């Protein structure tokens, strides 16, 4: 029914469905590509599809449009939003730049297109340390996540100015040391894979620090993992590695923005060609330049 209807319209629209790793299992199951936001945007550049339906949040659909300006990019819900990315206002960047005019501005790929337009370079979780160590400055402005900034500071020794100072992801901030201790109590043979958006005392307990793309790449290093990220990641890992064991660190670690996406509104997205994601031409050019620079440095 709904699934066959989506496939019919996907075919008719010359569309591809890109689903983030935190998407509901039934959404991942009908997606053409599944991964993190940068992986998804880059996968779409492989084909001349006319339409992208982005099963994910606002900034990720923007990144797809930045790297695929020739595609119509749809987001099924205007309530699929990232709380962390939207804490960062342009004024935050400008104030830090005014104070430290020789410091490069680095934006985590989890950020608005508009923020990327003020960046000298973007970073992923996997390359942030290498890229920031390579930047030609001992002081770096970095946003929007203060916990990832703290991790980068510890690993590079550089002076990292987080913008905004309090920027963070509520989904990952809620993991505590109590959750680490419960994980080890219940699963003593497991290792801990921990997203760098978790708080520093939780990062310190990690066996690996990785965002979702790196969790998939490094899961080969052990056969049993407790997963410190949004709980739907556990479904993706179990599907890719059915011989291993994966446990959520907390079942109630959910991203409300990701849960705005449903099969029903993916269908309505295709039927009505909504909601079209718009990125201003000069913002996209400036954001593209920062993303391409990141690839040069990695
Ligand atoms: O930083 C990786 C980009 C990605 O699209 N978002 C994630 O960070 C998860 C998140 O949204 O916090 C990921 O690792 O999948
Ligand atoms: S999990 Fe956090 S950072 Fe990732 S999309 Fe949801 S709110 Fe944004």
UniProtKB/Swiss-Prot annotation:
InterPro entries of this UniProt entry?
NadA (IPR003473), NadA_sf (IPR036094), Quinolinate_synth_type2 (IPR023066)
Tell me what this protein is called. Answer: Quinolinate synthase
> Which species is this record about?
Pyrococcus horikoshii (strain ATCC 700860 / DSM 12428 / JCM 9974 / NBRC 100139 / OT-3)
**What residues bind iminosuccinate, as annotated?**
20, 37, 108-110, 125, 195-197, 212
Q: Which gene encodes it?
A: nadA
Question: Which GO terms of type biological process are on file?
Answer: 'de novo' NAD biosynthetic process from L-aspartate
Keywords of the record: 4Fe-4S, Cytoplasm, Iron, Iron-sulfur, Metal-binding, Pyridine nucleotide biosynthesis, Transferase
Q: Which cellular component terms (GO) are annotated to the entry?
A: cytoplasm
Q: Matching SUPFAM superfamilies, A to Z?
A: NadA-like
Q: What is its EC number?
A: 2.5.1.72
- Which residues of this UniProt protein bind [4Fe-4S] cluster? 82, 169, 255
Q: What does the UniProt entry state concerning the protein's domains?
A: Contains three domains displaying pseudo-three-fold symmetry that each contribute a cysteine residue for ligation to a centrally located [4Fe-4S] cluster.
Q: Describe how the cofactor binds.
A: Binds 1 [4Fe-4S] cluster per subunit.
Query: Where does the protein principally reside?
Result: cytoplasm
